[PDB]
Amino acid sequence: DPTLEWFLSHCHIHKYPSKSTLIHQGEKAETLYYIVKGSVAVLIKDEEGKEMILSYLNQGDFIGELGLFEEGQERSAWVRAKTACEVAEISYKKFRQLIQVNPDILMRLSAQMARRLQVTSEKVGNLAFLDVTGRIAQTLLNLAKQPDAMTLPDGMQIKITRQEIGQIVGCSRETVGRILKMLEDQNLISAHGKTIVVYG
């Protein structure tokens, strides 16, 4: 792809092991990142430091974009490598140069920002309006329609744990496991420890 190849030619790319923290909330934002390979979680915390997963991001996703457009912003969340990752980086200052050369690279970034706003808005509604079963059900549907979901003969395979679902919907891992058992009994899913199949 020529636009993304040109862009990456102006970055420097680095390897990070699984569980590396790429971005820390509250740091000064001066750098944009782009996932060449691997997956990350975007995390926020409560007052006791307890984590919740705000999003997962994958190969082809920009990260660290939110301070690009205004001076002196701070990182809004933590970003942690869930797998080993290969991440391109570029300063905000150089990226702003690229945008004046070819605004298509800003369109590619902004498209992802717009998607994230859509997804995060929907999460506000799920948290505001739905009971725990309904939040879990939506979370499974959403994971199943991700590009990384694998098609099986009986449905979509997703890679997630009860603790991760809990950290998405705001309940305990035990509560998630009870609800997954209900959804299994209803013949809607098959739930293992690290994998769930959503039947279809």
Place this chain on the structure above:
Amino acid sequence: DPTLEWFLSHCHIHKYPSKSTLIHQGEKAETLYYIVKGSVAVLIKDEEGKEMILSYLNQGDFIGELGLFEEGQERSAWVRAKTACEVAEISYKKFRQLIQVNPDILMRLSAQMARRLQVTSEKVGNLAFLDVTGRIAQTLLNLAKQPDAMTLPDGMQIKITRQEIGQIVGCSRETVGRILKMLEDQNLISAHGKTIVVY
């Protein structure tokens, strides 16, 4: 500034009265808006019509931007006029030509998307981390720090209805009543009718 004035010169300007809906969730998105004057509320809804305010947007804000970057999308929320509004409107197709001539106009729009993502993400953490009591406590603390809060001898007085609290925190007006009474019992606020005093 010259970028904004250049942009507006390519738009069709129109007026909405207070309480009108500018954008309905689920409609096909083909047009970008920009608020020249007035203010709007961005909301989402229950199946049962329960509402939650995602944001207020004001003069200078783009609206209807989320469908710009891929064809075939639907509007993600309702946008309703909180006051009479004058709004500039441009097709996505035309606006994409503008971006190529001067991408500063996209920087302006993407700057607002970034702020909205930060604000909405904070709302997700509040909803997920806090029970309805904690959400109300925190909403009252926040309102007490706003300019419309009235400093009194006993603390900061706010004027807000149970209804209005519910469409911030995600609970019904009756639930709001119960929590406020509990908080009062704990000698943290006084709460009666639409008048709250935060000690």
